[PDB]
Design a protein around this ligand. Structure first.
Ligand SMILES: CCCCCCCCCCCCO[C@@H]1O[C@H](CO)[C@@H](O[C@H]2O[C@H](CO)[C@@H](O)[C@H](O)[C@H]2O)[C@H](O)[C@H]1O
Ligand SMILES: CCCCCCCCCCCCO[C@@H]1O[C@H](CO)[C@@H](O[C@H]2O[C@H](CO)[C@@H](O)[C@H](O)[C@H]2O)[C@H](O)[C@H]1O
Ligand SMILES: OC[C@H]1O[C@H](O[C@H]2[C@H](O)[C@@H](O)[C@@H](O)O[C@@H]2CO)[C@H](O)[C@@H](O)[C@@H]1O
Ligand SMILES: [Rb+]
Lengths: 221, 232, 121, 232
């Protein structure tokens, strides 16, 4: 239920030839919840913990989406941090899985960023009216979203008609739980430069180049 | 058969905890009645039939607890250490309050018998009706009721804590949360009598009147506590 | 060609499977049609044109067809007659003449979703 | 194993209501016997063996109720609030009449013992045999029997009221309807004694003779009530 009790659990699991937690450390979207759990003082706390996990050899230095996914699906790691989309691949494997609340850090919850999967029409396209037809009458329909969802789960769909079906799924409940504890990302043009600043900062601190104090300095600029 | 249409009953298969529990409930209601002496003469027979009103009240009370138990184990199908622990605490409280309930039920049946005018038999058999004894009456039975509902709240909270392990959906999560609130609200009324009695503001029977009067205003006082949390 | 008129809310596909067994044992085609407003299209078409060979509808509409002269008198032998309940034959009788073959008794009931409503009104 | 070949048994799986119920029935028949004192000497041992005739009659009576219970829960597999309520009322009545049955069975065993000429022991142990006491004997046990059959009728009517939910077929509907009639007809005989005793037309033992004589004519009187409804 807490981030701070993972090192103990990892010691226990490493004795039996298993990892505790493996997730994508390269992409900052996955590390941000821990960083933003308290908050600055909050970012310094959250990241130092993440740095200590790699320093204590609990997590690998270059842990990416593929080796994390594969390891969990194989049955090598006890935990992973991922989205709705990742569930179908677990179902394919013979792993009795559960989706739950993200661990708390310094008592307070880990605040994951909330994304709204969205479809936009390219300004330089001649098929603008044909795409509108596809998006409205064929995709954003009960039947249409069902098709996408049975391949790889969408999460909490924007369609009003899908509320009953969403509410019947335990994994969706866990997703909504984390979404409430998190916050929706502003759409602003500066998001790109922000994400890059966090992507470098996390990689530098993970590998062992820049200090945790120096990471937030370069990132705030 | 079931309370909610959106709830997926995990405990349709009978388990040892439930079997054991059924034995205890059956034993409680059975020994309450059959702890009495066997009539040897017509006089004893008629005396023993005066006990049915007190027993009906006791039995009604025990099955109500049994029902809540049935619904909990039906909902979650739980069988872990902590559930076993809380379950034992529950049955323990039940058991220690079986004979005291027989007592209270007989006592109140005589008091209500006198009021309505059905009978006019003595209450000197029960001992002296003093302020200290009448206060301890509230505190005792009030502590009993509080505990039962307190334990039901803890049991539902244990299920809430294992929501993911149990694969609880949004409807089931909501039910569980509502069941915790319900049991805490139920527990609050005996907790409030008990506290009022233990402080004893008046230093006389007035204390006992108020403490006793909170049970008659169960429904309205429960609504006040529920309304306070929703208003904020 | 054997043509049958039955309502679209009934089992015309199944009625066709019976018709398919008939063609195997005789050689006659059994097509099953389900046109809209057949209860009020039959007495107009069957009077003037050809229409169907056999018409399927609740017994209540058949007295009007019988009075108008749009239906042949049914003459079933005792042994066939005895296979069906005697009360059913009464429904298909107009002025002491059998005007149809009884198939089944139909009555509306309250259909309810047990999940949304376990103890219905 | 089953009563009807056309009945589809919904209650082949054991449930909590049935498990609880089995505990109570087992406890009733067990404590009836084992409520006696433990023999400490040869004299007590021989005395305790005189109790087997009264106990056999009691046990036979209780399993007959258990059987009806087994068949009901087998037929419908019911587990709702109202079924729980009616089920509790049943077990409650059973329980309150366990020790009174032990009494009646011992009393009647002495009376029938005197008649046949097996024994010649005193009935003064039972208290005074007065008109009021012998009337209360009928009213008591008559009220008990009436209630048990009344409850079985209510239970079957609850299943009849849920015929659609239970997906009962024409044969099962018919059985259920017949089971209601059976239990009401069974209940009628103790209801008729009870009423005759409570009015007391003669003002003497004659009342008790008639009231008692209706049980000996159970089968024929049941046929009269059944014949009256069919004749119209
Ligand atoms: C409302 C109207 C009903 C009022 C009922 C009040 C009953 O009150 C209660 O009666 C029973 C009569 O058996 C007494 O009980 C007494 O007899 C029973 C008879 O088997 C013995 O088991 C017991 O040892 C003895 O205490 C209680 O001590 C008395 O408190
Ligand atoms: C027909 C022939 C059989 C006649 C049997 C009549 C039995 O009658 C019954 O006997 C038993 C003998 O134990 C007496 O019972 C007595 O002894 C038992 C022995 O364990 C004690 O539990 C009980 O306290 C005491 O009442 C009853 O009080 C009496 O009413
Ligand atoms: O990693 C930073 C990256 O995170 C988010 O992208 C998510 C995307 O939203 C998810 O659907 C998922 O596929 O993973 C991506 C990260 O791996 C932001 O949306 C994106 O701007 C940002 O670059
Ligand atoms: Rb005892």
């Amino acid at each position: 239920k807490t981030w701070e009790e993972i090192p103990a659990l990892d010691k226990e699991l490493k004795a039996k030839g298993k990892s505790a937690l493996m997730f994508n450390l390269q992409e900052p979207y996955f590390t941000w919840p821990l960083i933003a759990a308290d908050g600055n003082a909050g970012a310094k706390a959250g990241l130092t913990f993440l740095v200590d996990l790699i320093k204590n050899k609990h997590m690998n230095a270059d842990t990416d989406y593929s080796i994390a996914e594969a390891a969990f699906n194989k049955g090598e790691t006890a935990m992973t941090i991922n989205g709705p989309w990742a569930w179908s691949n677990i179902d394919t494997s013979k792993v009795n899985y559960g989706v739950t609340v993200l661990p708390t850090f310094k008592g307070q919850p880990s605040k994951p960023f909330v994304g709204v999967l969205s479809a936009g029409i390219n300004a330089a396209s001649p098929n603008k009216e044909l795409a509108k037809e596809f998006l409205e009458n064929y995709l954003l329909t009960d039947e249409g979203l069902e098709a996408v969802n049975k391949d790889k789960p969408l999460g909490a769909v924007a369609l009003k008609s899908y509320e009953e079906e969403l509410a019947k799924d335990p994994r969706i409940a866990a997703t909504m739980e984390n979404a409430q504890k998190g916050e929706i990302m502003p759409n602003i043009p500066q998001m790109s430069a922000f994400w890059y600043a966090v992507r470098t900062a996390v990689i530098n601190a993970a590998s062992g180049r820049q200090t945790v104090d120096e990471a937030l300095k370069d990132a705030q600029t | 058969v079931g309370l909610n249409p959106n709830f997926s009953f995990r405990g349709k298969q009978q388990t040892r905890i439930e079997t054991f529990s059924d034995a205890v409930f059956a034993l409680a209601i059975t020994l309450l009645v059959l702890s009495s002496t066997i009539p040897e003469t017509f006089e004893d027979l008629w005396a023993s039939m005066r006990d049915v009103i007190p027993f009906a009240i006791c039995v009604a009370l025990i099955i109500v607890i049994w029902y809540q138990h049935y619904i909990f184990f039906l909902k979650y199908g739980l069988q872990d250490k902590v559930t076993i622990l809380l379950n034992t605490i529950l049955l323990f409280v039940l058991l220690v309050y079986v004979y005291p309930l027989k007592f209270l039920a007989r006592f109140l049946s005589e008091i209500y018998g006198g009021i309505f005018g059905i009978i006019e038999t003595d209450l000197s058999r029960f001992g002296e009706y003093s302020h200290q004894n009448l206060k301890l009456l509230m505190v005792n039975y009030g502590l009993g009721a509080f505990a039962i509902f307190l334990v039901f709240s803890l049991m539902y909270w244990r299920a809430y804590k294992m929501k993911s392990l149990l694969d609880l959906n949004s409807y089931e999560i909501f039910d569980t949360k509502s069941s915790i609130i319900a049991n805490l609200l139920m527990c609050s009324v005996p907790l409030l009598s008990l506290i009022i009695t233990l402080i004893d503001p008046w230093g006389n029977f007035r204390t006992t009147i108020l403490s006793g009067f909170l049970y008659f205003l169960y429904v309205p006082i429960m609504i006040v506590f529920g309304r306070i949390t929703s208003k904020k | 060609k054997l043509v049958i008129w039955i309502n679209g809310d009934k089992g015309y596909n199944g009625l066709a499977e019976v018709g398919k067994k008939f063609e195997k044992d005789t050689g006659i085609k059994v097509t099953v049609e389900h046109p809209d407003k057949l209860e009020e299209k039959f007495p107009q078409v069957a009077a003037t044109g050809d229409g169907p060979d056999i018409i399927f509808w609740a017994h209540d509409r058949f007295g009007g067809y019988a009075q108008s002269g749009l239906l042949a008198e049914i003459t079933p032998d005792k042994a066939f007659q005895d296979k069906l309940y005697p009360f059913t034959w009464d429904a298909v009788r107009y002025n002491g003449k059998l005007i149809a073959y009884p198939i089944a008794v139909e009555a509306l009931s309250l259909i309810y979703n047990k999940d949304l409503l376990p103890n219905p009104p």
